[PDB]
């Protein structure tokens, strides 16, 4: 029986629970460049000598169990919803904070459409106060 262990006690090994300041998600981007797990491309870039790109990543993990899977919205294993908003091309799964996948910009990013519109013949998305005030050539 357990009566010869002697190493009986507690561990104080602190670790990040879920999400990040950059993206509130229950997943980490698995970078195939080093098979490593980071919420953000810049949170990868800080630790690594090389860059993560949001088209190069293919897989993700679920921070709520650590199960490795392909880039999907839910952990089929423990039903972990990675975010409200999902998008495979941009490889972002996080909370919907009024964000929109613009067709001409070809991406989505945390951007309230009530404040942000696409300036036509410009390929950019600006604020309603800006009104598209550019040299749009
Ligand atoms: Zn981050
Ligand atoms: Zn890497
Ligand atoms: Zn899971
Ligand atoms: Zn997108
Ligand atoms: Zn746009
Ligand atoms: Zn413009």
Curated annotation (Swiss-Prot):
Binding positions (Zn(2+) 4): 87, 90, 101, 108
Superkingdom in the source lineage: Eukaryota
Residues annotated to bind Zn(2+) 2: 33-34, 44, 50
Binding site for Zn(2+) 6: 119, 122, 134, 136
Main location: nucleus
Binding positions for Zn(2+) 3 per the UniProt entry: 62, 65, 75, 78
Signal peptide stretch: none
Ranges annotated as CHY-type zinc finger: 13-80
Induction and repression of expression: Up-regulated during the S phase of the cell cycle. Expressed at low levels during G phase.
Any one of the GO BP annotations: positive regulation of proteasomal ubiquitin-dependent protein catabolic process
Residues that coordinate or bind Zn(2+) 1: 20, 22, 40, 43
Reported modifications of this chain: Subject to ubiquitination and proteasomal degradation. Interaction with PLAGL2 or KAT5 enhances protein stability.
Catalysed reaction equations from the record: S-ubiquitinyl-[E2 ubiquitin-conjugating enzyme]-L-cysteine + [acceptor protein]-L-lysine = [E2 ubiquitin-conjugating enzyme]-L-cysteine + N(6)-ubiquitinyl-[acceptor protein]-L-lysine
GO cellular component, one term: ubiquitin ligase complex
Subcellular location: Nucleus; Nucleus speckle; Cytoplasm
Zinc finger (CTCHY-type) in chain: 82-137
Function, as annotated: E3 ubiquitin-protein ligase that mediates ubiquitination of target proteins, including p53/TP53, TP73, HDAC1 and CDKN1B. Mediates ubiquitination and degradation of p53/TP53; preferentially acts on tetrameric p53/TP53. Catalyzes monoubiquitinates the translesion DNA polymerase POLH. Involved in the ribosome-associated quality control (RQC) pathway, which mediates the extraction of incompletely synthesized nascent chains from stalled ribosomes: RCHY1 acts downstream of NEMF and recognizes CAT tails associated with stalled nascent chains, leading to their ubiquitination and degradation.
Name of the protein in question: RING finger and CHY zinc finger domain-containing protein 1
Organism: Homo sapiens (Human)
């Amino acid at each position: 029986m357990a009566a010869t262990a002697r190493e009986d006690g507690a561990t104080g090994e602190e670790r990040g629970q879920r999400g990040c300041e950059h993206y509130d998600r229950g997943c980490l981007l698995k970078a195939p460049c080093c098979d490593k797990l980071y919420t953000c491309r810049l949170c990868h870039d800080n630790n690594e000598d090389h860059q993560l790109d949001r088209f190069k990543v293919k897989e993700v993990q679920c921070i709520n169990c650590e199960k490795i899977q392909h880039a999907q919205q839910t952990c089929e294993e423990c039903s972990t919803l990675f975010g409200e908003y999902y998008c495979d091309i941009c490889h972002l799964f996080d909370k919907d904070k009024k964000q929109y996948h613009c067709e001409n910009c070809g991406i989505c990013r945390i951007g309230p459409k009530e404040d942000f519109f696409h300036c036509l013949k410009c390929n950019l998305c600006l604020a309603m106060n800006l009104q598209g005030r550019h040299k749009c050539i």
